């Protein structure tokens with residue numbers, strides 16, 4: 218489950234960091250990267266607790 | 268650790284609430300304060316669970 | 318909690334007035350690829366009387382509330398001057414990229430300040446042609462935030478090296494201008510001045526028009542020290558500082574010791590006493606009496 | 614570029630070095646013959662007979 | 663010109679990284695510091711490259727005059743510094759100069775002088791640190807008398823700021839006007855131990871050796887028996 222949680226978008230346009238970097242400009246890619254970071258952090262917090 | 272968690276920006280321009288309040292308009296300051304509130308609430312939840 | 322009773326403001330006594338005017342109405346504003354610098358320092362500022370829009374098309378401030386410039390202050394305020402068309406004013410914005418933003422002037426992604434631009438067609442528009450203005454168009458690589466580049470070389474496009482020949486696949490990087498009153502409004506020359514500054518631990522000598530107030534001791538009051546706000550009680554300290562130290566922190570890293578900007582003495586900061594409140598009740602079926610217990 | 618030098622190759626809006634990475638849809642090509650002095654007439658924003 | 667000699671420093675060159683005040687706190691900071699146990703040249707006056715800071719420690723008997731010249735080309739094509747402690751005048755000026763060791767004025771002429779500062783008219787180990795960051799110039803110094811025949815002695819000494827200059831010019835080369843030691847600076851991470859009086863007493867690296875990294879992670883100067891986790895490879 219923890220590994221499968223990587224591929225989810227968590228609300229971002231895409232779930233690959235390199236695609237976000239290349240497709241979008243640096244000023245806007247920050248929000249997508251932040252959303253991905255928040256999602257992955259929440260998944261890691263569900264883990265460890267379990 | 269809980270005390271040290273108060274110094275992180277969490278994405279806001281500054282980690283000091285008074286500094287944001289005295290330096291930004293309410294319509295802009297609200298969206299900055301929201302991120303700090305979310306971060307501190309998350310830290311408090313983690314501490315309580317542990 | 319204990320509510321504060323008074324507010325005090327402590328600012329250095331500065332008589333010199335900031336020469337903001339000099340950069341805002343001058344004659345020979347330079348070109349965009351060679352923007353000039355100006356280090357305003359050690360003076361009381363008056364953003365208030367210059368926020369008043371004379372003719373400024375834009376006054377967008379990023380990171381600071383425009384109407385709150387007077388009360389607070391910064392450190393080492395800067396200013397840049399260059400002339401650009403009306404259609405390219407948008408390219409001067411943090412993060413956002415453009416043809417001239419990526420070749421002449423690139424603002425840092427965490428920039429703080431305002432981009433003050435206005436109109437210059439009324440005076441700086443010669444009918445014969447303002448042909449003294451140039452702007453770089455070609456560069457081998459991208460620029461850097463707050464980067465200076467003056468040297469000009471013959472551009473080489475792919476093969477056929479030029480070696481200063483100005484031949485095929487060779488172009489002069491600088492391109493002229495056609496600033497004349499006859500052209501459209503969208504291409505008239507606009508004078509742009511961008512203000513950059515930072516907030517630092519080192520004392521901020523530049524400050525806005527504000528009044529000082531006498532010191533108060535052993536009372537829950539609001540305080541202000543060079544723009545630093547908060548709440549607490551001020552007590553005379555015995556911790557010896559160094560002749561170059563101004564602030565003071567602790568393990569939690571919170572400002573608890575300050576040096577007076579006027580009298581140059583060491584103070585203390587302590588938040589007002591507070592604690593939880595707990596009530597003892599013997600139940601609401603025998604009596605309505607209670608007994609408050611303050612926690613600490 | 615490897616061919617013979619062209620009389621006019623100045624490009625507007627898009628740079629040849631960056632033209633390889635960026636690309637469009639449905640490229641249209643038009644060929645015609647004019648006089649030598651009529652080249653200035655063949656330009657955006659230019660009016661001629 | 664004598665060939666250089668390479669002696670080994672003994673953990674010297676730590677300065678106060680900020681104007682803030684901390685006491686009895688094990689603080690970690692990340693900035694430009696002189697790496698411990700690093701060779702330093704022992705010149706006994708050619709032009710030296712100057713990359714990011716410099717550690718200039720000189721031994722003198724009775725405080726003779728000291729001179730330093732910075733710049734990029736030193737040919738009046740770029741601004742230059744002429745930091746010198748002279749009895750006639752202690753002039754700290756940034757101006758174009760054509761160039762030479764003490765004619766009282768070694769520069770041929772001065773055409774356009776952007777900045778010019780004059781202060782009041784004017785065995786022992788002297789240490790100096792020069793930095794060029796974000797258009798600022800900073801000078802740190804300390805005077806610790808010593809009585810040995812050896813050079814940089816063992817021990818731990820603190821450096822404090824003296825003058826900040828907003829010169830903001832391009833500097834890439836170094837020149838100087840008894841012996842002096844030269845050592846360059848690199849980005850490092852340091853742990854500082856301010857005492858109860860507010861002064862620095864001890865400091866340890868975070869990259870020299872694995873024990874240093876173990877002490878750095880634990881944020882303490884003493885490590886008890888046991889296996890620890892340090893970093894990732």
Ligand SMILES: *[C@@H]1O[C@H](CO)[C@@H](O)[C@H](O)[C@H]1NC(C)=O
Pocket residue numbers: 330579
């Ligand atoms: C003005 O500030 C200086 C600080 O150098 C202080 O010595 C002086 O007393 C101040 N002026 C007044 C009238 O207090």
Ligand SMILES: *[C@@H]1O[C@H](CO)[C@@H](O)[C@H](O)[C@H]1NC(C)=O
Pocket residue numbers: 602603
């Ligand atoms: C209140 O509590 C007492 C305690 O037993 C009980 O005797 C009494 O009936 C209660 N009164 C009501 C109104 O519930």
Ligand SMILES: *[C@@H]1O[C@H](CO)[C@@H](O)[C@H](O)[C@H]1NC(C)=O
Pocket residue numbers: 668699700701702
């Ligand atoms: C410093 O340079 C000399 C030059 O040969 C070298 O022998 C010495 O090992 C160097 N210092 C260190 C710590 O490696």
Ligand SMILES: *[C@@H]1O[C@H](CO)[C@@H](O)[C@H](O)[C@H]1NC(C)=O
Pocket residue numbers: 734832833834
């Ligand atoms: C300083 O001068 C050197 C040439 O000595 C040059 O390479 C460099 O780009 C200039 N600017 C900076 C910031 O180093």
Ligand SMILES: *[C@@H]1O[C@H](CO)[C@@H](O)[C@H](O)[C@H]1NC(C)=O
Pocket residue numbers: 857858859
């Ligand atoms: C702090 O300073 C006082 C006064 O000079 C001195 O007596 C004391 O020894 C100092 N503290 C330490 C740890 O040296």
